[PDB]
Amino acid sequence: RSKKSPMELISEVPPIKVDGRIVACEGDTNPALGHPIEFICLDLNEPAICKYCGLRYVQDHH
Amino acid sequence: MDNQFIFKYSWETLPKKWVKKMERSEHGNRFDTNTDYLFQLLCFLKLHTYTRVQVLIDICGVDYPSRKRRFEVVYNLLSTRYNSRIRVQTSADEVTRISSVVSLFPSAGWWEREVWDMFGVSFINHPDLRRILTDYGFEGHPLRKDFPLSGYVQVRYDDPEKRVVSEPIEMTQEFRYFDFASPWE
Amino acid sequence: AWRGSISKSMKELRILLCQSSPASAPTRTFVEKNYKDLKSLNPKLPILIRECSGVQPQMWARYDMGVERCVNLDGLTEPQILKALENLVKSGA
Amino acid sequence: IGVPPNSANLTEARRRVFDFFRAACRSIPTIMDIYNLQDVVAPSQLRYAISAQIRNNAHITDPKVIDLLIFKGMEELTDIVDHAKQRHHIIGQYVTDFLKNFYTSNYF
Amino acid sequence: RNPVGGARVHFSNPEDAIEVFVDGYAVKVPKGFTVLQACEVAGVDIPRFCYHSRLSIAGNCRMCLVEVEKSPKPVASCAMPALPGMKIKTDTPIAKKAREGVMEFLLMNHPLDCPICDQGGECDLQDQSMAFGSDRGRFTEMKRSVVDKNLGPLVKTVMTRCIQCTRCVRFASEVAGVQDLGILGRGSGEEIGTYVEKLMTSELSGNVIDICPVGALTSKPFAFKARNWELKATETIDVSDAVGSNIRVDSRGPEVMRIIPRLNEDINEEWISDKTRFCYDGLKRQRLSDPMIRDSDGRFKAVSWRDALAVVGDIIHQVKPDEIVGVAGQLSDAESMMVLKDFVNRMGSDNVWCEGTAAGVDADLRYSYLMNTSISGLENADLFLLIGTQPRVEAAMVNARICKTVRASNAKVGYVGPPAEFNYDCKHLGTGPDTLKEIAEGRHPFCTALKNAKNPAIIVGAGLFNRTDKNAILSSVESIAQANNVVRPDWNGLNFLLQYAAQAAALDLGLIQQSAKALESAKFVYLMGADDVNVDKIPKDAFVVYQGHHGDKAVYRANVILPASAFTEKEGTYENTEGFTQQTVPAVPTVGDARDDWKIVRALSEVSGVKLPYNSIEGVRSRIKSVAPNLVHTDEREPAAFGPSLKPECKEAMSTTPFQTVVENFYMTNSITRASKIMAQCSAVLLK
Amino acid sequence: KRGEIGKVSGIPEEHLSRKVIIYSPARTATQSGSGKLGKWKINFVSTLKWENPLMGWTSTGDPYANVGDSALAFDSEEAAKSFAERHGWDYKVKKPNTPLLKVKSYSDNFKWKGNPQPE
Numbered sequence A: 001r002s003k004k005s006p007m008e009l010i011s012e013v014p015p016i017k018v019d020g021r022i023v024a025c026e027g028d029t030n031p032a033l034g035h036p037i038e039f040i041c042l043d044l045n046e047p048a049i050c051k052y053c054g055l056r057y058v059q060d061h062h
Numbered sequence B: 001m002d003n004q005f006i007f008k009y010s011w012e013t014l015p016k017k018w019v020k021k022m023e024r025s026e027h028g029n030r031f032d033t034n035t036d037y038l039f040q041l042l043c044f045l046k047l048h049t050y051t052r053v054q055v056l057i058d059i060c061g062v063d064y065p066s067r068k069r070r071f072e073v074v075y076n077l078l079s080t081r082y083n084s085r086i087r088v089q090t091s092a093d094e095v096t097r098i099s100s101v102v103s104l105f106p107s108a109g110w111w112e113r114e115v116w117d118m119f120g121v122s123f124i125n126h127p128d129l130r131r132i133l134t135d136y137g138f139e140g141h142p143l144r145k146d147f148p149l150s151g152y153v154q155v156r157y158d159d160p161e162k163r164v165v166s167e168p169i170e171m172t173q174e175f176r177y178f179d180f181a182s183p184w185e
Numbered sequence C: 001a002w003r004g005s006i007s008k009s010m011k012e013l014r015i016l017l018c019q020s021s022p023a024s025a026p027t028r029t030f031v032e033k034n035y036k037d038l039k040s041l042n043p044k045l046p047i048l049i050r051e052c053s054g055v056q057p058q059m060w061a062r063y064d065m066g067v068e069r070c071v072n073l074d075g076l077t078e079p080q081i082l083k084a085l086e087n088l089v090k091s092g093a
Numbered sequence D: 001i002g003v004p005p006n007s008a009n010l011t012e013a014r015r016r017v018f019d020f021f022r023a024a025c026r027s028i029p030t031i032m033d034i035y036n037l038q039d040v041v042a043p044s045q046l047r048y049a050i051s052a053q054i055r056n057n058a059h060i061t062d063p064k065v066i067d068l069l070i071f072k073g074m075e076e077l078t079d080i081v082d083h084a085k086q087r088h089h090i091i092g093q094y095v096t097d098f099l100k101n102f103y104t105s106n107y108f
Numbered sequence E: 001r002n003p004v005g006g007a008r009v010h011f012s013n014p015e016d017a018i019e020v021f022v023d024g025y026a027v028k029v030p031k032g033f034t035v036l037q038a039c040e041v042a043g044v045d046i047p048r049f050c051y052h053s054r055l056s057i058a059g060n061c062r063m064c065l066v067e068v069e070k071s072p073k074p075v076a077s078c079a080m081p082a083l084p085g086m087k088i089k090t091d092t093p094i095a096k097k098a099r100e101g102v103m104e105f106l107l108m109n110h111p112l113d114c115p116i117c118d119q120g121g122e123c124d125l126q127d128q129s130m131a132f133g134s135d136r137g138r139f140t141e142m143k144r145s146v147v148d149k150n151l152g153p154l155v156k157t158v159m160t161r162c163i164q165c166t167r168c169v170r171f172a173s174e175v176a177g178v179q180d181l182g183i184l185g186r187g188s189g190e191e192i193g194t195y196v197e198k199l200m201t202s203e204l205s206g207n208v209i210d211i212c213p214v215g216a217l218t219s220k221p222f223a224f225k226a227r228n229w230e231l232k233a234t235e236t237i238d239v240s241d242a243v244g245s246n247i248r249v250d251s252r253g254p255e256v257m258r259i260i261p262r263l264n265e266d267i268n269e270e271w272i273s274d275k276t277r278f279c280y281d282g283l284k285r286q287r288l289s290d291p292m293i294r295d296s297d298g299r300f301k302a303v304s305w306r307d308a309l310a311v312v313g314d315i316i317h318q319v320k321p322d323e324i325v326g327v328a329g330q331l332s333d334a335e336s337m338m339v340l341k342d343f344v345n346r347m348g349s350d351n352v353w354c355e356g357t358a359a360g361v362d363a364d365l366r367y368s369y370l371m372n373t374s375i376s377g378l379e380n381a382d383l384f385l386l387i388g389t390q391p392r393v394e395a396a397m398v399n400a401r402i403c404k405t406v407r408a409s410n411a412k413v414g415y416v417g418p419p420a421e422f423n424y425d426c427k428h429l430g431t432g433p434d435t436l437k438e439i440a441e442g443r444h445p446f447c448t449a450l451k452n453a454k455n456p457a458i459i460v461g462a463g464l465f466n467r468t469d470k471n472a473i474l475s476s477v478e479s480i481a482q483a484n485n486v487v488r489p490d491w492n493g494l495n496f497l498l499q500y501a502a503q504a505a506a507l508d509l510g511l512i513q514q515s516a517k518a519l520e521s522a523k524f525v526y527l528m529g530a531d532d533v534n535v536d537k538i539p540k541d542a543f544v545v546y547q548g549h550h551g552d553k554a555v556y557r558a559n560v561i562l563p564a565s566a567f568t569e570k571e572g573t574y575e576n577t578e579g580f581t582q583q584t585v586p587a588v589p590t591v592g593d594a595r596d597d598w599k600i601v602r603a604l605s606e607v608s609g610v611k612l613p614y615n616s617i618e619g620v621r622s623r624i625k626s627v628a629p630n631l632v633h634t635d636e637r638e639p640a641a642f643g644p645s646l647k648p649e650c651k652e653a654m655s656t657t658p659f660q661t662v663v664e665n666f667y668m669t670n671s672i673t674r675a676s677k678i679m680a681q682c683s684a685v686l687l688k
Numbered sequence F: 001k002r003g004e005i006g007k008v009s010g011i012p013e014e015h016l017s018r019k020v021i022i023y024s025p026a027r028t029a030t031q032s033g034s035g036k037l038g039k040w041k042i043n044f045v046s047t048l049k050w051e052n053p054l055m056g057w058t059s060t061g062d063p064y065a066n067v068g069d070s071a072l073a074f075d076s077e078e079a080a081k082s083f084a085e086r087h088g089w090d091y092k093v094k095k096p097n098t099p100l101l102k103v104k105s106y107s108d109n110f111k112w113k114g115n116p117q118p119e
C-alpha cells in the first residue's frame, strides 16, 4: 500500500511498553544501522515520541 | 644540497639590494625580491656553479585585493643537479609591467601567457603575449577575486541566426554560498 | 504691522542654522529673540527650525503653489535678517 | 615583437595611441575581405567607429593605464585579423525616461 | 594589540588604571573589569557559557577558568575582579586541561540530537567543543533526560539539551522584568521551568531564543525551517515601532526567514521586541501585487500601471485645487513623504499629515516632539515622571532602559494615566490632567521627591497630542519642567516619546495637519499606507486611492489601488524618537508588480501634468536637504539646539477627561503584524 | 571617481555604475564568540532573485549575487574604500557598532538594599 503517508502511518503503530523512568531508542535493532541513540524521559501520561523515529514509548507501570 | 645550506650560501653570495624579503622554513626557501631585479636574480640563480637552477617548474599568481600591490607572481624553481627547490616571488599591479623570463627558461612563455589571461599582469618583451586559456573575445580576467564565479556572459544557440551566440548570464539556480565560518577560530 | 500679515502671504517658513555656528551665530541670535514674539502674533503659521550641524544658514519660504524663494543669510546682521524676511514676505503678495 | 616596456611621459602615450590607430587602419581591408563583407558596410564608417572608441577614454591621465588600454587594443585587433572571431561579431559590436523605466521594472 | 570585537574601554577615571599581564603582554584596565574583561581588552578570547555581558555575573559552568601565578586553584575569570600586577596564564596546561575536563562533563549528559537541533550550525557547545575540547569521549553509561513542557506559542523548548547555565533565568529576572522562569530541583536532575501551566507573557520575551547558547530554547515559528549557513545576513533597521532597533534580516532566496537583533549600544542594546522579531511572517501573507481598478459592480480587476495611473491623473484634475488631501502612513521612509508633500503642494493643496496623532502637533522647534534625552542617557536619570505614555506597549525597548535604570540605580517612577501593568514598582499618581495640575502645585509627596532628585526625566507620550488641549497640557508639563529644573545645559530632562517609525521624519519634513475639518469634505484622498485612519470620516463620493503593501481595512473602501513595497525591499531613511537618522537595506526582492512609494508618487505627479526637479533617489535626498537637512546625515548624534523658553503662553484651561490609551493590542499595530499568522495566534493566548 | 582601473578591468560597462555599501558585519546574536569581526566587505545589493517556475529553485540574473560574500574580503576599511574607488563604484560606508565595556563586578549581585525606613 502507498496511500498512507508516513504522517498517518506512524500513528497506527501502538506505543511501546517499557518499565523505568527512561528508555533508549536506537531505531533499528542494529545500533549502527539506526539513528543516534535517544534517551527519553517518559514521565508524562502521554506517550513520549522519539524525535528521530517517531516511535511512541509509554510507561506500563503506574 | 641541504635546505639550510642554500639559505646561508645564497643569502651570503647574492647582492644585498636584490632580495627585499627572504624566508626559511620546512615548507620551502623563499626569496621575495623587487619587481625590477627579478630578471637579474633569476639569471644569477640559473648560472651560478653552486646554485644551478636549470628548470623552472611554474609561474604562479596570487590575488590579494587588500594591498597596494594586489597581485603576487610566484616562480617555483628546481635545481636538478643539487636536488633543491627554491621559490622566488614578486609583487605586481593592474597596470605595472614586470620583466619576462622567457629568455632564461623558454618554457615560461605559456605560464606567462596564462598569468596574463587569469590575472591581467603584462610581461615586458614577451613574444606573442595573448590569452591562452579563455575563449576568443573574453572580457575580464577570471582568476581575480572580483570576477564572479559564474561569469558575466552565457552561450547558447539562436535559431534566427544559424550560429552560437552570447547573452548576459541568466542562471536557472543561483550558486548557494554556504557560510560555514564560525567564531572561536 | 507687517509681522501680523505673514500667514496670508506665505506658509511653512523654514530657517536653517548650524550647531557650532561659525557663521550661523547671527541666525541663532535672530531666531532666539525673534520667534516667540513672531508666533505669538502669528498663530497657525509653521515656522520650522532645522539645525543639521554642518549646514549653511539658508532661509526658505513656500507660497501657495509651492514655489520656493530661499534667501541666503550667511553674512548678514539681525536687522538685515529682518529686512530679508521683509522682502521675502512682500514678494509673496 | 615583444611587449613595449612602458611609457614614462604622456607624449609617448600619445605616440603609441597614434601608432595603434594607424595599424588598425592598415589592417582594415583584410578584415573587410576575410569576413566576406563588401557592400553591407563601407570601410569609411569603421574609421569613425574606431576614432569614437579611442576618444571614449579621453579622461585617462595615468600613462600606464593608457599603455594597458592600447595593449588590449592590439590584442582585440589581432584577434579580429585572424579568422577566429565569430561571424559578424564585429559589425554587431562596432556599429520622460523616468516613466519609461517605471513602466518596465522597479530596478530601472 | 587591539581589543577583540572592537570593544571600547571607557576610562571614567584616568588616574585609576591597574596594569595586568594577561599572557606577558601588559595592558591597562580601570577598577573592576574582572579577569575575563581584562583578557578581552588585550585581544584574548576566552570560552564562556554562563557569562553574558548584559546580565549579572554567575560562576557556574566553570568554563572560563584561567591560571593566575599567585593562585593555587584555577580561578573563574568571568567573576574574579582584576587586581594590579597579576600574571594571568591562558595557554597553560592547567588552564587547558581545566577546559577539556569541564567540557567533558558538559557533553557527558548532552543528547545526541545534533542533526535535529534547530541550533546545529551556530551552537556554542559544539563550536567550542571543536576548538577547546578533547575528541575522544569517555562516557559510556546511560544519560539522563528531561521532559519538554510547553511555554509560549513562539518559544519551542527541548530541555533535554539544556546545560544549566541559568542565563535564561537571569535574563527573565533582570532584563525582561517578569519573573516566570526559574531553576527547580537539586543536584543532577535539576530542571528549569515555570512549575505551572503559565507561558512567558512579556513584550521582550522572545530574546530568550538568542541568549540561550545551546539549542534548548529555540523559536517555534522558525522550527526546522532552515539552517544558519543557508541564510544571507542583511543589516537593516526596524519600522514596527519608533525605537528603530537595529536588526539583522536573514533571507534564503526571495523570502525572509528570521530576524535577529543587532548590537547597538545607543538604541536597543542587543535586544528586540517580539513584535519586531516575528513580523517577518506578514511580508509573505496577503499583499497587493498588481494595480487594481474598482468596477461598476464593485469588482476588483487588475490593470497595467499605465492604465491605473492614467485613471488617477484624469480624476485628480476634476477636483478643486483644495480637497486633495493626502495622508502618509506609519511605514513610509522620509523620501516618500517628501515626494508626497511636494506632489500635493504643487497641486495647490496643503492637506498633508502623518497617520496617527498628527492633528495639530506643532512640529515646530524639534524638541517638542523628540526624545531630547538620549535613550542611553536614561540610565543617568534618578526619577521618571511617565505622563500618559505607558511605554511598555508603544516603545518596548524604552521600557527596557527604564527597568534597567530602576533596578540598577534604584530610581523612582511616577506614572500618570490609565491603569496598566509594569515590570517595575511604579507609583500611580493619577489618571488625568487634574493630577498634572496637582503636580504643578505640590499636593503629594511626589512633588518633594521630584524636587529633591537631581537629573530627573519627564517622559510624555504621543497619545497626549491627540487631545484637544494639546497646548494646555504641553504648557502644564513645561511649567512643571521649569519649576523643578529638569532641563539644564549639561542635562536635558524633558523628552517626548513617539509611537510610529514614520512620525519623527514626518514632523521633520514639516507635513502637519492644519485643519480638523480635513478628510471630511475633501474628495481626493491619497491614502499612502494609512491603514488605520478611520474610513468612516471620508465621504462616500471621494475616489480614495490606496498606496500600500498590505491591505486590511482601507482596501475594502478603496478605489484604484497601487501596490507598494515593504521596508525589507527599499532603501529610504527612517528617524528615531531621539532624532537619530538611519537607513534600510533591500534584503529581498519586491513581490509582484510593485514599485517604491516615492517612485509611484513621482510617476503619478508626472502623469498629472506637473513636473518635479528630481527623478532619482539621489535627487530626492538633495531636495530633503532644503526642508529637513538632518535627515541626510546618518551617523550624527546631533543634540537639541534650543531650550523650551521659546514657546508662547497657553492660558486656556486644560480639561476634565482622563488620559486614554492609544494602542490596545500590542501584537497588532501595523498592517505587517495585523496580517501575520504567528502574531495573530500570539495575540490570542498571550494577551493577558 | 578615477575609474581607470574600472575601465581596464574589462567587465561590462553597465556594471561600473552600481551603488555598493561598505560595512563590517557585526557579531551574530546566537553566538558569543568574536572570531568573525574586524573584516570589511563590499555589499552589492543583489536584490532581484525570482523563483524558477519548474522546481522552485531560486534563479538570478545578477552577476554579483554572491561575490561580496563568498570572496572579496578586505582587512580594513581603507582598503575596501580604495578598491571601490578604483573600480568606480558609488560606495557608501556604514560604520560598525562596537560594544562598550563597562565595570561589572560579581559583588553587585549582593547589595545592602538600603535600610528598612518607613514609606
Ligand SMILES: CCCCCCCCCCCC(=O)SCCNC(=O)CCNC(=O)[C@H](O)C(C)(C)COP(=O)(O)O
Pocket (backbone or CB within 6 Å): D014, D017, D024, D031, D050, D053, D054, D055, D056, D057, D058, D059, D060, D066, D069, D070, D073, D076, D077, D080, D090
Ligand atoms: C576593427 C577594429 C579593431 C580594433 C578595435 C579596437 C576598438 C577600441 C580601440 C581601443 C580603445 C582604447 O581605449 S585604446 C587607446 C586609448 N588611448 C587614449 O584614450 C588616449 C587618451 N586621449 C588623449 O590622449 C587625447 O585626448 C587624444 C584623444 C588622443 C587626442 O586629443 P588631443 O590631441 O587634443 O589632446
Ligand code: SF4
Pocket (backbone or CB within 6 Å): E110, E111, E112, E113, E114, E117, E118, E119, E120, E121, E123, E124, E125, E126, E161, E214, E215, E216
Ligand atoms: S544544542 Fe548544540 S550540541 Fe546540543 S544537540 Fe543542539 S547543536 Fe548539538
Ligand code: SF4
Pocket (backbone or CB within 6 Å): E161, E162, E163, E164, E165, E166, E167, E168, E169, E192, E211, E212, E213, E214, E216, E217
Ligand atoms: S534554557 Fe538555555 S539559557 Fe536557560 S539554563 Fe538552559 S541553556 Fe541556559
Ligand code: FES
Pocket (backbone or CB within 6 Å): E047, E048, E049, E050, E051, E058, E059, E060, E061, E062, E063, E064, E065, E076, E077, E078, E079
Ligand atoms: S563563563 Fe565564567 S564561569 Fe561560566
Ligand SMILES: [Zn+2]
Pocket (backbone or CB within 6 Å): A025, A026, A027, A035, A038, A050, A051, A052, A053, A054, A055
Ligand atoms: Zn528512535
